[PDB]
Structure formats: C-alpha cells, structure tokens
Amino acid sequence: KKPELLIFDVNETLLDMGPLENAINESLNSEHAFSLWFRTLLHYSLTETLTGNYVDFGTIGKATLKMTMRKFGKNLSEDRLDAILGNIKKLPAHEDVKEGLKMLKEAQIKLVALSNSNGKLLNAQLQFAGLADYFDAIFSVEAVGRYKPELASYRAVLETMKVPAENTMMVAAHGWDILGAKRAGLRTAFVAREGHAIYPLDGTPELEAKTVLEVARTLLKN
Amino acid sequence: KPELLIFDVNETLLDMGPLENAINESLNSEHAFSLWFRTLLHYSLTETLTGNYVDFGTIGKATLKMTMRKFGKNLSEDRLDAILGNIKKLPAHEDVKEGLKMLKEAQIKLVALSNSNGKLLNAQLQFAGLADYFDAIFSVEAVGRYKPELASYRAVLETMKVPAENTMMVAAHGWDILGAKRAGLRTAFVAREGHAIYPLDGTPELEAKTVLEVARTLLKN
C-alpha cells in the first residue's frame, strides 16, 4: 500500500503562484486574467505536441500572455512582460509542503518532481522555495519534449527511476495531471489547491486532500 | 485561388452570444465563458493525449461544471444542460452568408469542420441557416481525433480528394490556424473580437476581420 515512488507536480501543487498571479492580474487589471492566461498556456502546449512540435514552456507562456493581454485591452512592452513573467522564478512553497515532504522522505519513499517548466527554471524554482533537497531527482518534461499530461511524460520518469507505474503515485493540483497519470497506470493524489477541480469524466484520484501535508499523513497512517 | 475552403464553425461562423450570455448570467460574471471554453479545449486535447476520444459536448458539460465550481456556484445538472443547449441556438455572424455566397460563386468548394459531433453540428448549422451553403459538413467524431490533430484536417482532404496545398483553413482560433498550417494547408485568420494569432509560427497566409472580408481579400484582382 505504500508507494515506492512519489512524483510531484510543482506549479500550484508545491509552489504558491501568488506572486505571478498578482503580477498578471494587476497588469491586466482583472482578477480573472491569470486563470485565463494559464489555461491558454496549457492549451497551446498541448496544441504544440499534437502538431508535432516542442517549444519551451516559458516561451509559450510569454506568447500566450501577449495574446491574453489583448483580450483585456492592454498592450504591454517587452520589458513589462519580462518583469511580470520573472515572478515564475520567485514562487514560495505553500506553507504545508516542507513538513509533508519531510515525513515522506523520512519514510524512505523516493520523491521526484516533474514539471512542464524547463529544467533550468525548475531547479531555480525549487532552490528559491527551499524544496530542492527533498527530492531524489528533479525532472522537466523538456528532456523528452512532451508536456504533461501526455503519457510519455510520466513514462520517462518511471523509466529513469526504474519503478513500475503501479508502484508510483502522482501528486498534483491539476485534474488533467491526475487524468494522465491514471491512464499511464499510476496511483494518484489530488491536492485541492484553491481554484482547482477534479475532472468529472473518470478523473477521480485514489486520494484527495487539501494540502500535501494531508496527503503525506494519509499515506503514512498505519 | 484555393480549390477548397475549410471553415471552422464556432465563433468563426457562429455568434456565440446566446451561449456566452447563458454561462455568464448563470455564473454571474462576464469572464465565465472565456475560461469555460478554454478549459473545454484544453481537456479535449488532454483526452486525446491520454489516449481517449470523448464527445466534445460531453467534455463541454464536464468543464462547465468545473467552471461553475471555480466561480463558487451550485447550479443543478439540469441548469448546466439548459446553459449548454444554447450551443445549438447560435445565429450566424451577420457577414457570413454573403461571404460564403461570393466564394461559391467563384467556384471554390466550401466545407465546415468542427469538433462538435455530427448531429450537433448539423443542428447548429440548420439553426443558423448556414447548412445549405456548404458542399460538405464534417465532424471530428468520424475520425475520433480533434482539431488541431493532423487526422482531423486530413479526413476532410481525403474525402474531398483535394491536396493540402490547394486547401485553405478559415478560422478565428490561432490554434486551428497552427494545426492547419502544420498539416500543410493554407490559412486565413478571421479576427473576431477576443481572438489573437499565436505568435510562435502561427501567422496565417491571410487575415481579415470577417468572413466576408476574407472572401473579398481572396477574390480581389
């Protein structure tokens, strides 16, 4: 019943996106801008893979912020866009994360991170948040050139760690990440960070919790 | 000069107003429709990338429930059905019919291609009075792969027996422009309010504000 391996999504699951959310919403003068931008980023990332291409996630992020800014009547300069997006490198951990990761690491469950962010950005993010040392390995989808939730993204991690899908649990605050992990055969835990929903069409996880700490306590109980 | 024009349907041809109004009024926000529809599109590509094909309207219902929750609301299942029923009650944009008439008079073949299932798509185009303008009406349901997957455009090309390079995709969605381009098609972006070209190699061959203006640009000597 204990997983051999936990794979953690990073954005929102571990990292509080507030600094970036606030910067986008302030610049576009709407509390609704961040959510529409990030969904557009995710949408175009999957558009890229389905049309046979891989582009750095942050480059899609900037491109789709330029598209979204226009929907809000703004036309931001290159310097303004870069300043907004620079907050992606300065995201603190959610307050529950470190204690959850600590107890999972003490229980000798292998812990890895998997993000659509490129490897250099992902490592800088986890260093800034003080989380990098909890992980046995830190993975960007950049290496295989296929974004989550494509099955190949999870599979690249399983093959590198040499752990079967069914001995692995994906921990994520994104319903689509839950869905992809499930369909690759992984166990799943949904972290119900504010503003995120489970996908109703067969997206139910094994575990649901409000925090990573609560996931950890459930796994380690008994 | 294209042999074949493929038209996207939602927004490109159809005024989404009735559906936009139903979602925004029901969730009490002018921002609900844009977030819902982007979430729909995102999950449609999630479905195909995690190895699955699901009726587009069924994804629509599921992502509308998610969007309802993001706005903190508790609407009934029947209310979600009532909202989504407006997808079949969308009028054509006022420019569309004259544009389609002018292109067919120029002896260009005209077809529609939508992620909507075939029965829903027919119902939409009948309500809008557009169905009869088309030489063929295509749903991705037939191939089980959504736009912008290569298979979606290719099914049209193979049925119409027209090569990609003699076919132009007309769409108000930057991701549809990009899919068509990478399938080898020519492209025309219809710059309807609230839609942008994708900056990363998404530039179309032609751009205009309406379907009539695409027609006038295409046929200009």
From TrEMBL, chain A:
Coiled coil: none annotated. The keyword Hydrolase applies. It comes from the Bacteria. Its EC number is 3.8.1.2. Keywords: Hydrolase. Pfam families: Hydrolase. The keyword Hydrolase applies. GO terms for molecular function: (S)-2-haloacid dehalogenase activity. Belongs to the HAD-like hydrolase superfamily. S-2-haloalkanoic acid dehalogenase family. This is (S)-2-haloacid dehalogenase. It comes from Zobellia galactanivorans (strain DSM 12802 / CCUG 47099 / CIP 106680 / NCIMB 13871 / Dsij).
From TrEMBL, chain B:
It is an enzyme of class 3 (hydrolase). Its EC number is 3.8.1.2. Keywords: Hydrolase. InterPro entries: 2-HAD, HAD-like_sf, HAD-SF_hydro_IA, HAD_sf, PGP-like_dom2, S-2-haloacid_dehalogenase. Transmembrane segments: none annotated. The keyword Hydrolase applies. Pfam families: Hydrolase (PF00702). GO terms for molecular function: (S)-2-haloacid dehalogenase activity. The keyword Metal-binding does not apply. Belongs to the HAD-like hydrolase superfamily. S-2-haloalkanoic acid dehalogenase family. NCBIfam families: HAD-SF-IA-v2, HAD_type_II. This is (S)-2-haloacid dehalogenase. It comes from Zobellia galactanivorans (strain DSM 12802 / CCUG 47099 / CIP 106680 / NCIMB 13871 / Dsij).
